[PDB]
Amino acid sequence: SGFRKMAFPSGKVEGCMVQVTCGTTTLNGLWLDDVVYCPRHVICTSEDMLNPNYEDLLIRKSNHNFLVQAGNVQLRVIGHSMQNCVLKLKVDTANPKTPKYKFVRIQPGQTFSVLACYNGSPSGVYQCAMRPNFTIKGSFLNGSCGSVGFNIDYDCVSFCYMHHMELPTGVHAGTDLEGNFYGPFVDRQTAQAAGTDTTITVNVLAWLYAAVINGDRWFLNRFTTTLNDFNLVAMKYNYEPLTQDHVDILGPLSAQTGIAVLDMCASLKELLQNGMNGRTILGSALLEDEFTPFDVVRQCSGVTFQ
Amino acid sequence: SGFRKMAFPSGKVEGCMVQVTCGTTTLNGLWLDDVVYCPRHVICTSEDMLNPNYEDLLIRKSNHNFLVQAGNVQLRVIGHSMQNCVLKLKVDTANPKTPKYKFVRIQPGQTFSVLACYNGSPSGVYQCAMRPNFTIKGSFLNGSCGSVGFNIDYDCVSFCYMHHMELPTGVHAGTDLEGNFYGPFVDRQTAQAAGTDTTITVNVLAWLYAAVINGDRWFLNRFTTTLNDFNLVAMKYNYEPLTQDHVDILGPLSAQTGIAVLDMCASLKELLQNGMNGRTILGSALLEDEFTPFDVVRQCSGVTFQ
Numbered sequence: 001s002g003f004r005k006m007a008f009p010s011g012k013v014e015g016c017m018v019q020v021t022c023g024t025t026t027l028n029g030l031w032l033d034d035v036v037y038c039p040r041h042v043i044c045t046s047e048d049m050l051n052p053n054y055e056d057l058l059i060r061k062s063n064h065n066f067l068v069q070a071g072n073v074q075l076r077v078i079g080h081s082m083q084n085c086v087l088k089l090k091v092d093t094a095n096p097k098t099p100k101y102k103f104v105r106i107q108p109g110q111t112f113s114v115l116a117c118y119n120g121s122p123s124g125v126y127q128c129a130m131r132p133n134f135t136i137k138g139s140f141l142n143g144s145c146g147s148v149g150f151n152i153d154y155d156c157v158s159f160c161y162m163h164h165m166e167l168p169t170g171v172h173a174g175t176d177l178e179g180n181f182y183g184p185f186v187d188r189q190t191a192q193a194a195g196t197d198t199t200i201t202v203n204v205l206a207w208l209y210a211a212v213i214n215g216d217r218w219f220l221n222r223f224t225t226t227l228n229d230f231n232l233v234a235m236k237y238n239y240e241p242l243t244q245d246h247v248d249i250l251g252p253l254s255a256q257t258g259i260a261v262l263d264m265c266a267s268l269k270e271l272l273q274n275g276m277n278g279r280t281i282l283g284s285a286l287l288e289d290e291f292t293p294f295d296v297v298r299q300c301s302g303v304t305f306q
Numbered sequence: 307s308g309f310r311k312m313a314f315p316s317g318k319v320e321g322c323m324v325q326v327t328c329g330t331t332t333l334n335g336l337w338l339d340d341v342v343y344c345p346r347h348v349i350c351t352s353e354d355m356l357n358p359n360y361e362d363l364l365i366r367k368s369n370h371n372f373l374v375q376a377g378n379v380q381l382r383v384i385g386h387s388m389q390n391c392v393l394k395l396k397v398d399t400a401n402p403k404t405p406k407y408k409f410v411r412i413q414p415g416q417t418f419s420v421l422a423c424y425n426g427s428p429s430g431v432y433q434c435a436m437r438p439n440f441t442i443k444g445s446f447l448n449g450s451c452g453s454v455g456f457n458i459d460y461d462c463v464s465f466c467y468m469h470h471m472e473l474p475t476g477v478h479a480g481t482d483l484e485g486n487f488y489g490p491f492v493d494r495q496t497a498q499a500a501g502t503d504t505t506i507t508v509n510v511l512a513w514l515y516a517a518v519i520n521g522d523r524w525f526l527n528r529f530t531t532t533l534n535d536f537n538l539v540a541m542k543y544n545y546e547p548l549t550q551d552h553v554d555i556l557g558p559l560s561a562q563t564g565i566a567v568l569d570m571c572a573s574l575k576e577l578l579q580n581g582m583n584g585r586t587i588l589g590s591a592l593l594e595d596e597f598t599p600f601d602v603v604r605q606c607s608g609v610t611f612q
């Protein structure tokens with residue numbers, strides 16, 4: 001038992017991280033087969049980054065303008081190109097540690113592990129959700145651009161996120177590995193801002209089920225509610241609507257606990273209207289929304305990866 | 307910016323995990339050089355584990371009673387011995403992935419990363435503190451015994467914890483890597499129980515400093531307090547006493563924020579007496595005590611490991 005924000009083991013990703021230098025800018029790259037992926041704003045200078053023009057900036061660069069450090073070993077760049085907001089640096093060595101991988105784009109509401117990196121050196125790993133407003137509440141300092149987010153499905157790494165920038169509220173914005181931003185953000189220094197967020201309802205319900213599995217039951221009640229009357233209540237407290245597909249996804253968790261999905265919604269309703277009255281759930285005094293139903297089945301059942 | 311419970315990159319530990327089978331019991335082992343370390347209760351049966359007698363049980367075993375799986379590769383056990391509560395299985399192959407390592411025993415109040423493992427296969431990584439009562443609030447299911455806790459200091463893995471057992475409150479107990487239990491727990495099936503805990507005061511203060519660095523300031527005040535009058539207040543709310551050495555350890559964080567340690571104690575005093583009045587700190591509605599001053603300097607400054 002127990003319940004933690006748990007990241008995937010990071011070793012397979014650690015073996016892909018490298019340092020990319022262009023000019024006086026150093027950031028992180030992802031080395032898979034003979035390509036290094038990194039944020040294209042590496043080619044910008046301080047005054048470039050105000051309103052930059054990346055096709056112009058890139059034609060003025062040469063392969064030798066890019067220094068790639070794999071540990072204490074240098075890699076010749078033998079080619080370069082831009083794909084959307086990432087750079088693809090072709091190098092003369094295939095990464096012998098290349099795992100089986102995929103480039104996937106995730107949905108707001110889904111979770112992933114982030115291997116925070118500086119100078120190509122992994123610093124720490126932690127779990128994030130893609131917020132409904134397409135930001136992530138990460139932990140990132142200067143030099144962390146190019147760090148990636150990922151999931152692991154048995155032996156295959158599905159890369160979903162590359163870090164580009166921190167917004168003024170202290171949340172983080174980036175791209176999928178094809179260089180397309182999550183949300184309405186651009187790799188320029190404008191006045192862009194997150195935009196209003198919502199709470200991920202289906203995830204909160206999944207986490208209430210994790211609590212019941214781990215013995216917290218005080219918030220249960222005999223009451224019930226209909227999907228419509230619940231979705232009424234979610235809308236007032238700035239929660240996302242719950243769909244029938246969310247109810248279906250919660251099926252396994254409902255069956256394991258014996259608590260019908262709509263009954264747990266009645267509990268959530270009461271928790272939203274009454275607060276928690278000084279009690280806690282899974283060590284939290286807030287309703288937690290960054291565990292998916294998958295995540296809960298994962299720790300409360302115990303699946304591994306090889 | 308941002309602040310997360312962040313684990314160390316786990317790759318160096320992942321390359322050490324193996325599966326140990328003896329009879330019908332399977333658990334995890336740690337393979338360093340030519341030795342596999344694992345909980346000695348692997349040699350027990352269901353009826354053995356009531357009041358077991360390990361020297362007797364071990365002399366009845368042979369090297370071939372121990373099946374060791376390193377991935378899909380078997381390792382001959384060529385020797386076995388007991389050291390306190392762990393088994394040392396000498397195998398015929400040195401682990402080529404053996405990192406630089408140390409076996410260290412930690413203090414209640416310190417933190418570490420846990421690589422949860424099943425059947426020798428890493429499942430997830432997360433951050434824990436050693437509670438004042440020598441338990442850890444982990445996340446562990448059947449088969450997770452033998453999973454290890456660790457810290458990384460540049461390139462060297464300091465192993466501090468091996469998982470043995472779950473107590474009835476759902477917290478976890480185990481040993482250091484020399485086989486000596488943390489706290490008053492035994493690898494028998496008795497009625498043993500955690501025993502009363504306290505909140506780790508110095509860690510809460512470190513986390514308030516992390517909040518100030520990340521822009522939460524509402525809990526600040528001009529007030530001050532003396533160490534004695536604060537330690538008075540800690541004792542009522544079941545917080546550990548704060549020592550002058552704790553104040554010294556908080557020095558760097560005090561200097562970076564401009565908030566004297568004893569001033570932050572006055573803030574903590576008010577937070578304990580008044581609650582938080584519906585506000586949050588670093589996304590928490592509770593005072594968090596599982597980040598050390600080191601941990602805070604680590605994310606709010608950005609140190610890596612190679």
Ligand SMILES: *C(=N)[C@@H](NC(=O)[C@@H]1[C@@H]2[C@H](CN1C(=O)[C@@H](NC(=O)C(F)(F)F)C(C)(C)C)C2(C)C)c1cncc2cc(F)ccc12
Pocket residue numbers: 027041049140141142143144145146163164165166167168186187188189190191192307
């Ligand atoms: C990566 N190592 C670094 N990010 C950047 O350098 C990006 C990149 C240009 C500036 N920038 C920013 O993150 C800035 N933010 C913004 O322009 C905006 F708020 F998002 F609009 C800023 C002001 C330096 C934070 C471009 C936007 C393309 C990076 C990554 N994570 C965190 C930080 C924190 C920092 F203090 C500095 C740099 C960070």
Ligand SMILES: *C(=N)[C@@H](NC(=O)[C@@H]1[C@@H]2[C@H](CN1C(=O)[C@@H](NC(=O)C(F)(F)F)C(C)(C)C)C2(C)C)c1cncc2cc(F)ccc12
Pocket residue numbers: 001333347355446447448449450451452469470471472473474492493494495496497498
């Ligand atoms: C490891 N794979 C497993 N732990 C054990 O098998 C240990 C080990 C014997 C029983 N045990 C326990 O953890 C039991 N707990 C206790 O006896 C006590 F409460 F701590 F006193 C119990 C009742 C099965 C949980 C010895 C004590 C030496 C393990 C590890 N982590 C979590 C779990 C959860 C489980 F449900 C079962 C086994 C677990």
